[PDB]
Write a protein that binds this ligand. Structure first.
Ligand SMILES: CCCCCCCCCCCCCC(=O)O[C@@H](CO)COC(=O)CCCCCCCC
Ligand SMILES: CCCCCCCCCCCCCC(=O)O[C@@H](CO)COC(=O)CCCCCCCC
Ligand SMILES: CCCCCCCCCCCCCC(=O)O[C@@H](CO)COC(=O)CCCCCCCC
Ligand SMILES: CCCCCCCCCCCCCC(=O)O[C@@H](CO)COC(=O)CCCCCCCC
Ligand SMILES: [K+]
Ligand SMILES: [K+]
Ligand SMILES: [K+]
Ligand SMILES: [K+]
Ligand SMILES: [K+]
Lengths: 106, 101, 101, 101, 101, 106
């Protein structure tokens, strides 16, 4: 089953700076990657689907890029409300799988 | 109208049904099989379309017993319907030429 | 019944035979060739089915001389039988239209 | 001349048009989709040719919604035109045999 | 004998010629292009056979301009000949049914 | 997206010697590689297309080879006018991408 590697596990950025989360798949999965945000005590929330597609209700600040095995979730100018854990999830092959997660720290 | 046209049209409508049903059923049969890629509906509809036409790029295909069976049904429906349109055209052309002669 | 139907039916039955024989013979020809994947009967039957219909996904194929020959026999049998069903339908539609006119 | 020939010829000319338009439109639909390979015109024309004939090697194929739709149009145009040539030949052979008999 | 049979047979013989010529010419066009795999005659003959039948597994295919052109000629020759056999069968079945009726 | 690696970043050759620039792709791209030359304060100039095809107006001294992931740009007997930065560019998959560049030093 496809292994999704999220490294580093923790990221520290200064307020307003540009941050980038990385997700690496153990084999090519096209653009079948999706990103979720989970704040402390909250349930996961879909941020970006299919590597770069935006969801309605999500700040324009969030963007995604990549294809194949390497994927990135970017935030232009991070703010306090973005403090949370970030997970990638692939749907290219069964079974769906999740990356281990990256914590955003400001 | 004439039988052949009724048979050709009917085996268009039936094909469209097989494409949708064949697309829904392939996802049902393939989820659960480690490594399978025919697991979301949109690409499964594309898969069925390229199967029924017999183009088969190889970008997607069933790995399970049932998904494959579904695949065979999709293949026959497409090939059958195309053979019925060709036969209907020949009938229209033949019957039409009998006149021009 | 009419010849064409007898020929169409016959070249269904014959096709089913070629699918089973072509599946058994491909495994026989391919085992022994390093790298070959058409080596177990279940997937070989699936391989023959996708060959006879001319879909050819590319998930499986022969790499040896004999396995390939078998492949050509499977291809011709499938294509031939489909061309015989189309021809039988045209005959039924044509002969049937002569009436409606 | 006879209808069938007019229909066969017409659905050659139309096919050549679909091959060029289908080649130009696939590049338009596929650029912008990360990972896409059907993005330069020369290979896209080759892609359309192998799609319309239903050979589909799998060396190139659309990954976007629109590129795929274009693909379906290219498939139908090729299959349709080949079914129209076969039907035209049958008409010529049938009408021609009525004489020899 | 009857025209259609003469045309069907002729476009078998011609096909066999295209398979050999198409196999020799593909190797000629493809050698010299870095990465090409259609470069030895035996597998090139297998390639042509799977192209003319439209199965196209994707194990081998041309990457050069001329090799591709050759590929298109092989495709048309195979498809054309199969469409001529189907048309010849329909003529034999149709003319034969006129009797049974 | 395909990553094009150009290493070394700087190459030093003696006048008249044979030099070779390397470009490595992160995945197989056939022969869909192109080379450009950019002199100090100048705009890029197409040198070789599709890994080995010559362009008109370009010295015969320039040649290219390779397929798959490894590519080479060669210059038979370098001269002063060849002092510049060299970039590879792939067109196999979208989006087109450029290598980081190699500076030719004599
Ligand atoms: C339960 C019954 C299921 C029946 C099948 C339904 C499939 C879903 C609808 C199809 C597309 C939705 C688009 C989407 O959200 O996906 C796009 C995301 O980029 C890419 O689309 C794709 O890349 C797939 C293209 C499929 C083309 C099929 C052409 C047929 C003539
Ligand atoms: C000696 C004569 C041989 C003739 C061929 C016989 C082949 C064996 C029987 C077929 C399947 C057995 C299932 C099994 O144990 O395999 C499954 C294990 O998960 C997966 O099946 C497969 O994935 C293969 C699917 C093949 C589908 C063919 C559909 C044809 C209409
Ligand atoms: C805007 C409308 C676009 C319509 C499509 C036009 C496509 C471009 C012209 C075709 C080839 C140019 C050659 C070239 O510079 O490319 C060659 C470089 O080595 C390799 O060619 C190729 O490998 C592609 C081969 C395509 C063969 C198609 C055969 C069809 C019967
Ligand atoms: C100059 C004109 C060239 C015309 C084409 C001639 C091709 C050479 C003869 C064919 C095979 C020789 C065997 C050999 O030494 O190769 C085998 C080595 O293991 C494997 O064969 C192969 O794996 C290729 C199989 C090809 C099967 C084709 C079936 C067609 C009905
Ligand atoms: K086909
Ligand atoms: K095919
Ligand atoms: K194929
Ligand atoms: K393939
Ligand atoms: K294929």
């Amino acid at each position: 089953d496809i292994l999704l590697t999220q490294s580093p596990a923790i990221l520290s950025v200064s307020p307003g700076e540009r941050v980038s989360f990385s997700c690496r798949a153990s084999q090519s999965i096209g653009t079948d990657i999706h990103w979720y945000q989970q704040r402390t005590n909250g349930s996961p929330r879909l941020l970006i689907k299919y590597a770069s597609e935006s969801i309605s209700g999500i700040p324009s600040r969030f963007s995604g890029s990549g294809s194949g095995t390497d994927f990135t979730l970017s935030i232009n100018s991070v703010e306090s409300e973005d403090i949370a854990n970030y997970y990638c999830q692939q749907s290219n092959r069964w079974p769906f799988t999740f990356g281990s997660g990256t914590k955003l720290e400001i | 109208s004439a039988l052949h046209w009724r048979a050709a049209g009917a085996a268009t409508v039936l094909l469209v049904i097989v494409l949708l049903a064949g697309s829904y059923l392939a996802v049902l049969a393939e989820r659960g099989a480690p490594g399978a890629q025919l697991i979301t509906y949109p690409r499964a509809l594309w898969w069925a379309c390229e199967t029924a036409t017999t183009v088969x790029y190889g970008d997607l295909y069933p790995v399970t017993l049932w998904g494959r069976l579904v695949a065979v049904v999709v293949m026959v429906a497409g090939i059958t319907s195309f053979g019925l349109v060709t036969a209907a055209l020949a009938t229209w052309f033949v019957g039409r030429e009998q006149e021009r002669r």
